[PDB]
Amino acid sequence: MNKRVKIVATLGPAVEIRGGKKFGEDGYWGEKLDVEASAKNIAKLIEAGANTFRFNFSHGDHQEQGERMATVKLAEKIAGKKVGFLLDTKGPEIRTELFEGEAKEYSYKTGEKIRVATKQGIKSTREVIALNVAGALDIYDDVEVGRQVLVDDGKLGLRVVAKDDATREFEVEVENDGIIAKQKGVNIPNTKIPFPALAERDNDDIRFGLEQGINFIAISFVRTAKDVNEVRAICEETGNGHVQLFAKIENQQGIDNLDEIIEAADGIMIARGDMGIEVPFEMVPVYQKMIIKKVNAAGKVVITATNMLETMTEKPRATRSEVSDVFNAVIDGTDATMLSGESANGKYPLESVTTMATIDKNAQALLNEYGRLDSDSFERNSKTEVMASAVKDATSSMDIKLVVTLTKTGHTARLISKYRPNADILALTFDELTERGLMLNWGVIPMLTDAPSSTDDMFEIAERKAVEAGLVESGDDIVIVAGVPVGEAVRTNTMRIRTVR
Amino acid sequence: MNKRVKIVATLGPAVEIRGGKKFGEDGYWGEKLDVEASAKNIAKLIEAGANTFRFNFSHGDHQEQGERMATVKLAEKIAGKKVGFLLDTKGPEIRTELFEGEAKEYSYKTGEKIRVATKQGIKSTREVIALNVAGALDIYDDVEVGRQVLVDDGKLGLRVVAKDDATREFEVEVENDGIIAKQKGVNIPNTKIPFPALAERDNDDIRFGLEQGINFIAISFVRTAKDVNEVRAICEETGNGHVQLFAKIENQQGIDNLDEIIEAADGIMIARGDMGIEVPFEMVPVYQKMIIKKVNAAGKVVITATNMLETMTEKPRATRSEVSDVFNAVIDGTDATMLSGESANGKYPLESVTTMATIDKNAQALLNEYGRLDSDSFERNSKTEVMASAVKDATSSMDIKLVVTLTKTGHTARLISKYRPNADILALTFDELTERGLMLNWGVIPMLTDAPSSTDDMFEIAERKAVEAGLVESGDDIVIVAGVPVGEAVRTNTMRIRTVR
């Protein structure tokens, strides 16, 4: 069977060979990138069901990112299959500074009183922790006594007891035993540090990705619709209006402003990593189910992210909790599941994609029994959406092997996908940008074909493409929708039930 | 407002003028039928909402019946509207004989002991009641002691206490006070008197009707599939294969064998008059709701009959119970409601059809709130049925003014009607027999058009005929289904949502 749930795989050195050396091996970083050998490894990830690669601009300079994007373009040719390109922004990250010395880290013990500096471009000491704040902002007047400075995946807590106006330093109490290492993530929950709607470094990263050729931007730490619309204006003004924007929800402001963020964006990445530090970790499952429902109801794409097969970074088998998490993300209604370090940096990138594909394919078989999404509740808000509802009805009434839509922009395919039919969706489109642009919608198999003339039989074309793709065989029943005829129809207006010859 | 629930109106002398005289006036029967004046009265019933006329062969000879059927054909020309023609068989009727002397009736009291004669071709006396049994059957060995002989709409009960082998007479006890009049209906419940599957009189009646031109036969007292199959054989062998058969369910065997009868017939007439004598009267509403559900599930036609506006036989207003009965039959899911003496014999035939139409129209507006049928529960058992389900879905998703089907045989219109869409159904068909044969399906407006060729745009035809009929205006949304293209499609395979120009 075809895997309806889409996989986003983050790329990094794990798949990359450097003069015959694998990531980890001594001298690895001293060798030149073997592009063909790296492209062949990426090809296997595509074959195992990666539908989109994530280029995380938090790690690796423009040269590294651009070389990896080029390597994927070769892998597509090797695999015989296209994938989406997704750029993930750095955004308003706060990290611990480098320490004085060749000190890489210091261990602390509960109750121990230390300070954190707000002055930028200075090194840390054991007793005065400095921060690398995005854009070198001064955060002193934005964090109150009683606020928490969390270091490294929220592992070490520092309680702001007092503030020293003389040095612009936070006096903090170590809440629990743990280490402060250099260049680790810092979270300061329930604060509104005035990060700009779009920082110059993200502006620059996005413009670089847009020049290379991308299909999706995942915008880190979206707080408001303005954070999405600043990125949209770049995409539009550079001639890249086709690029789709996924707002990453990972803090309380993003949760509070979710409805306006969904309205501005093409989709949501549930960024559970930061989210579970910024809000109570036990609320993340609540927010996940609610986000997936609301995004599906808006006919947009939802990606569930972070830790999904975390153990497979270092070990060959996923835990039972990881398998349950992937499975339940599908039942919740996610369009897509994501890998981060598992595919980018781990010992088992191919096995991670394969394992996620196996779970995702099994979970899709239970959506009839257990799925949370309920298409019967939707308002049908347009005639294309009325047709999408009729398609879902036909797939419920009888055994339909495949829904085919002839779609110029993918709008019809997006609306069919919204309704989660009991069938794969072959989206026949007429340009490569629309084709790749569909690769994260649940159930959709995008395929490039010639735009039909007013003299072509679009129903015979649908059947022939489905056969050429190996998706159907003689005696299978398919549902085909189209705008008929070409030049008269203003939208998808026809549904045909056809038996394959 | 189109009336979706269909009306069967029994014709009789009430609408018929004879040498300037209306029914009721002395010497009426001594004058000859005024055909033109009578056709003008019938055209008013057609205009008021009568969709089919019932010719009851229990009353009036082949001359009365044939002249009435000719008079309707003129009425259709006057109204500019066609109607269905339904023959209702006499069947295995038992009536009281004429009395010796010139006695018209005797009155009896609870406990009196009299006899019922089984000998055919004699006259009744006060003490020995003679029966006129269909086909002159001897019923003596077919009714046990403890059975009941009911005279005149079940009003007087006679208990069989003993049988006189010498005279072949039932000794009976009068069960309640009442009258035995001449030529009154007799019922003997929970007996299996071996009336033939098809009596010669019903054979001859049906053959006469088939010659005149009928669309429907309602078969009285259907007990088994064989009672229906014997009539089907005559229709087939006379080249009247198009004629549709309604089994009348009006005794316990009909109820017991209901599934096999529904399988053999095209529809059911719920013949509540006899039914509520032959079975406990308080079970009739239970059987009504059950039969409507079952016949609708089978994709067949159900007619609810008898006493629906009974008071309007004598009075110009129906009782509160009559209006409630018509309203509730629609809510239960009936395709059609019927009038017997109200339209045939009463003082207010036109007002009876008008009153029924007004109630049926109001009740159809409450089918979304109160409607008992549930199309969501059906197995979609064919590709045409899957398309019918998708049409229903489209009419639930958005405001659809009309569904149009291009239907050679009516099959697509019957399956759309089964699903009870929130829309009228325009059934475009290519012969008059198919057209009239759709006149009792819920919501169907049959309309004759030229068979489309492979060069015709069936979707433009649909819009044109709907605009011509005055059913849609500019801006209305319609659903159109057809088998496209003509000569290649083996069935209805296409649905279009179209805005009227």
Add this chain to the structure above:
Amino acid sequence: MNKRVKIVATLGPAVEIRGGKKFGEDGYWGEKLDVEASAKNIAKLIEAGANTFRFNFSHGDHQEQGERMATVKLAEKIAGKKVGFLLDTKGPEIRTELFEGEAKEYSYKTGEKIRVATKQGIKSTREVIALNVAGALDIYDDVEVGRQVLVDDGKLGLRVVAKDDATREFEVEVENDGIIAKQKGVNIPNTKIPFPALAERDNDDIRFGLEQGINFIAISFVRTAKDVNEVRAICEETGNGHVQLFAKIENQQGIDNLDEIIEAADGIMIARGDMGIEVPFEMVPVYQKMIIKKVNAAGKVVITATNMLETMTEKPRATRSEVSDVFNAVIDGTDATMLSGESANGKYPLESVTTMATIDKNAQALLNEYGRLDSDSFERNSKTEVMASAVKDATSSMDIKLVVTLTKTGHTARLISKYRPNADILALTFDELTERGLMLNWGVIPMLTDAPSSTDDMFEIAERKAVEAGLVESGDDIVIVAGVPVGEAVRTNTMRIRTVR
């Protein structure tokens, strides 16, 4: 097996014997009332399932009404069973006057122009119909050009085309052929003739009935809460606070103000006879279902009335539409069904009550499958209501033969009845006025017992009363509720499931 739906039977001369003569026989009103003979006939209606008798003060003087009420008290002793006493007011009736000089009626044809006079105390002529308006009100200023004057159960329409200020006469045109007879009902729909909130004639009839001993008042033509509250004030003033008020809903204003009327009243009588003249007849079934739902959700009593078995006034069997109407009133959720002329004036009063009881008992068995009422949707607004919901739950979980409630005021029985449990409700109460006041609540069997002391076993009392009433036998499971213990409990606070010894 127990009849849960209650029957209100209207009393009159039909059951009354006079010097050995039955109603309709020659010199009937010549003879004196045989009280003992008449009381034996009424006891048979009690035994057949009449739960309350209606005394219609629209007909017969105080002496006739008081004697009839005395006859019922004897009938209760003969039957060994108590019934409720219900007074139905005259209210604001309009009747046609006597005609000039002994004359009875005239016939009229469509388009004919006559007058109706508003002056009170004068006789009609054929040309000038006079009205007997309740309280001799002058209606001339309260009826607009464009209204209709309907005579005799709405059968003849008179359109008001002009008004003659000189004579205070309506110039009317006959809308349809028909008859104006002396002393027939007149309706003038959608008018607000300023009938007082309480007329003197109704005050005097209500104070009379209260002096005789009644349990219920059904207030004709209720328009607002004020019409109910005026009668409440009489009941309060006279120490008859226990008397329950049923608003009769029978015009558009009553329908428009239904919510505030239900609030003010103890219940609603759906007075379909006048309603179906004052509003479009085809709307009565919609309003009937809606009123039953709203009154039940309020925890109050609804009576469905008028024409339920109308044919049985004159014939020994009801029509199929009459049986359907009674059956469907039960399915709709009525607490009670009513007989008017069928029990008061017809030839078959006993058969009418028996027939209604048979239908009501069969319909109650189909409430699980078809019942319109939905107790799952109610807000449980008090702890007694939560206990009523839990009782319903227990009767759905297992086979419960009987629910018993020990109730001082009947509150707990009313709430249990509201929930329509799958069981009869035995209401053990401690005074006859409470007992009689429960006789129209669905499923409630009221029974008089001593008030339990702090020392009594109320669960043993419940079982003993149920066994002595013949409602349960050994091995039956019952649900008993009570306020335990007496003296400490402030409401019904206990549910016990008990197996009968």
Add this chain to the structure above:
Amino acid sequence: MNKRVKIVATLGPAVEIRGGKKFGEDGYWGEKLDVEASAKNIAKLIEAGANTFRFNFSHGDHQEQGERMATVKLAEKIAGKKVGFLLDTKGPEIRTELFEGEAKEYSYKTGEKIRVATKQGIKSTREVIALNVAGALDIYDDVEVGRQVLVDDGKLGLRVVAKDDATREFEVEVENDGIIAKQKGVNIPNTKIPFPALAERDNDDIRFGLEQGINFIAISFVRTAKDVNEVRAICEETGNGHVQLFAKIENQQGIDNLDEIIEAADGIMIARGDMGIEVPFEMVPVYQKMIIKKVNAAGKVVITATNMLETMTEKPRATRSEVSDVFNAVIDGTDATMLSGESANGKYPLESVTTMATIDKNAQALLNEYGRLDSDSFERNSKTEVMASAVKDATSSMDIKLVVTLTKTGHTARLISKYRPNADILALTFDELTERGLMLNWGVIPMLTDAPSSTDDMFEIAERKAVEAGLVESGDDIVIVAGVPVGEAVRTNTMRIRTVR
């Protein structure tokens, strides 16, 4: 709020202090157990919401197990709170043999051909792996070609490609790069190695636990009902009939025989660790949801086990997939969640129990919205179960703070728990064995109280104990059930709604 989902915490050296050393400090095992210091750590796990401690007899001899149980009895005194004692059996085990020349492990590469010996009492070589099978059984005739030998938590796969009848050796191909170390766990999925229903080692370990005093036994690798019944016979024979048996379902045979095992057991432990090696890993979520539903429908206890907070063994915070897993186990309907190495052997035992309790408490607030279990579907199979349903109804109708049951054996408390009321359940019981035996039922707070006397007010006692436990305050509404009168009632037969003073 009170935590309704129960926590099973496995005990081990993580919480144990030995001469002032914590587990993993140098010379830990050289110091003797500090019983007080260990009991103080254990008391903190109780206070954090551990409801039952698991004593895993797979690791540690009788002396270590008995000393650990004594330390828990002191911890209960420190906490002022009791916990359940659960014995987990060693059960059938296969382990890799020691290697010749005291070698520790060998590395192997995908595609290598090696051998597996079935001959017992023999050492492994790199080329010929030998197995230590429980009872030294000969495996050869139980394993067919196409089966797998999986080594070390299923990390290394060996496909059986051929068998050699002369050496009784399996020819295996290495399926992935990995290590075969000495004395590691081996799984052979989908085989029926004839391990005894109850091995002597398990028989002896169970008798030791029963003599120490336990409340639960979890039976490892239950394959059929006989594996439960053999343990039940030992509980019955030794006078320990109160001990409850949880079948561990962890292989294909246990799943195939689930219905008969649920019938024999008191509950199920979903042993996901072994299950996800023994069945396709992607099927575990399917089986988990199905087992929870079936065990709850049977009125029995289900524990979801293994890897729930696995990362917390080494790190102070759980992953997003782990929090999701715990949350979703609650939504699926689990009675209890379990910790293994997280509480027994990790760095953060107290943090692991606190985190699991935080997640379980948040998830229970979403059971109304998202809960999978459907109590409306259950057949109520006894009168106690009817009362449990009524209790649920009361908690759905109004805001109920607490359900109190006075329960002699816990049966009523088990049935209320089965229905998952919107309330905590205080189970007032009269002996410590019944008390401890309720500690894993969802929502049940067991509390030892004096048996009520014939003159006691059990409803007053319920209120008093609820206030004593701190579960209610003034104005709260509670539901109380009991068998009334005490001792004479055959079962719980009474429900009261009471307002707390």
